[PDB]
Amino acid sequence: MPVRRGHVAPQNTFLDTIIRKFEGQSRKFIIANARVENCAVIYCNDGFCELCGYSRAEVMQRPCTCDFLHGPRTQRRAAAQIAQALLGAEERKVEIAFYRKDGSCFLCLVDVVPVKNEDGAVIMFILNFEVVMEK
């Protein structure tokens, strides 16, 4: 990429494990900035990492569309619906084939959940991932 933004301050680490134990952490999800046009990942879970076989260091400063995961089976119409879901103010699911780093494939359900701020405008997207059919 020709240019990138950082600005991530260090969080708590031990306490964050108590939130992860208390919360519904058992599914895959990532947080992306909705104001930036490409929708860069600003945060990610632990389940998304093991589901695809990448890492936070690789998926950080990337667009949340995950276009890199598209193989020969991947549906260009679904890749479009994920990109168009980032133009909407409301919740949206799209179904699509992704690859895993070991060379296996699967149908993923991608669900974007819009996060509004204190003024009632959408400023972050949470994208969740679920395996709907393993191939």
From Swiss-Prot:
Tissue: Highly expressed in heart and brain. Isoforms USO are frequently overexpressed in cancer cells.
Effect noted on mutating residue 57 to P: In LQT2; uncertain significance
Effect seen on changing residue 16 to A: In LQT2; uncertain significance
Substitution effect: residue 72 to Q: In LQT2; uncertain significance
Mutagenesis or variant effect for residue 106 to Y: In LQT2; uncertain significance
PTM summary: Phosphorylated on serine and threonine residues. Phosphorylation by PKA inhibits ion conduction.
Organism of this sequence: Homo sapiens (Human)
Effect of residue 43 to C: In LQT2; uncertain significance
Result, substituting residue 74 to P: In LQT2; uncertain significance
Function comment: Pore-forming (alpha) subunit of voltage-gated inwardly rectifying potassium channel. Channel properties are modulated by cAMP and subunit assembly. Characterized by unusual gating kinetics by producing relatively small outward currents during membrane depolarization and large inward currents during subsequent repolarization which reflect a rapid inactivation during depolarization and quick recovery from inactivation but slow deactivation (closing) during repolarization.
Annotated effect of mutating residue 70 to N: In LQT2; uncertain significance
Effect ascribed to mutating residue 100 to W: In LQT2; uncertain significance
Effect of residue 72 to L: In LQT2; uncertain significance
Induction: Up-regulated by RNF207 (at protein level).
Protein name: Voltage-gated inwardly rectifying potassium channel KCNH2
Superkingdom of the source species: Eukaryota
Domain PAS, first and last residues per copy: 41-70
UniProt effect for mutating residue 45 to Y: In LQT2; uncertain significance
Domain PAC span(s) in chain numbering: 92-135
Compartments it resides in: Cell membrane
Family: Belongs to the potassium channel family. H (Eag) (TC 1.A.1.20) subfamily. Kv11.1/KCNH2 sub-subfamily.
